[PDB]
């Protein structure tokens, strides 16, 4: 009923931190993302993950990195974690020079394509927009798609919020909840605490009325088959 987290290694935590984009793309610099990246590095380090930070990767570099990691031998590793910090659209995350399909990234780790991760939890944490909606708020033995979890910062169709000084609402909340609860709660319960923190404690402040007083709810997509405990 619980994933075996007893392997000699917890696993890799790959962090892709895209801050600066090619001028031709017209995408803005993502101020505050370094705060996210360092926060995640320390957070996952504490959970005994082998963290690898990568900054400002082209769409080609993203695909290549994911391919290479998926080809590594994860036999002695309990799990796998990938954190993507960038611009995005529905189903898409941006390299510094253009988009990459999230499906193409996650496909490398399918149960049939990454044999040494089969039966192990594969976690993708995505801080990126998923469209342009704003929330105004109110008052074979095993399936190849099994054992993935996707923790999206925001609802499908919606912008995701990042504070230039404090980092993104989602990553801020995720790291805080992991620090506080990773020694006591199952991962889905931790992520539910993250949902509540983002939903209740954050609200945008803008001089632009269109973007002022807006809200955010993250979205957990779980195809996990067992409970995941970090201890």
């Amino acid at each position: 009923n619980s994933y075996k987290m007893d392997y000699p290694e917890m696993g890799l935590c790959i962090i892709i931190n895209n801050k600066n984009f090619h001028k031709s793309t017209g995408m803005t610099s993502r101020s505050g993302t370094d705060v996210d990246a360092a926060n995640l590095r320390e957070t996952f380090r504490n959970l005994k993950y082998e963290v690898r930070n990568k900054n400002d990767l082209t769409r080609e570099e993203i695909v290549e990195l994911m391919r290479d990691v998926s080809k590594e031998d994860h036999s002695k590793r309990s799990s796998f974690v990938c954190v993507l910090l960038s611009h995005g659209e529905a189903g898409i995350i941006f390299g510094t020079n253009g988009p990459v399909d999230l499906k193409k990234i996650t496909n490398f780790f399918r149960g049939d394509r990454c044999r040494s991760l089969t039966g192990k939890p594969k976690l993708f944490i995505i801080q990126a927009c998923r469209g342009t909606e704003l929330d105004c708020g109110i008052e074979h033995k095993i399936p190849v798609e099994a054992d993935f979890l996707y923790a999206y910062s925001t609802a499908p169709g919606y912008y995701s919020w990042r504070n230039s000084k404090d980092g993104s609402w989602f990553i801020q909340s995720l790291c805080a909840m992991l620090k506080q609860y990773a020694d006591k709660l199952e991962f889905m319960h931790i992520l539910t605490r993250v949902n509540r923190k983002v939903a209740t404690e954050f609200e945008s402040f803008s001089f632009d009325a269109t973007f002022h007083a807006k809200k955010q709810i993250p979205c957990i997509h779980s195809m996990l088959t067992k409970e995941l405990y970090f201890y």
Partner: peptide, 4 residues
Amino acid sequence: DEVD
């Protein structure tokens, strides 16, 4: 506050 900025959007991604």
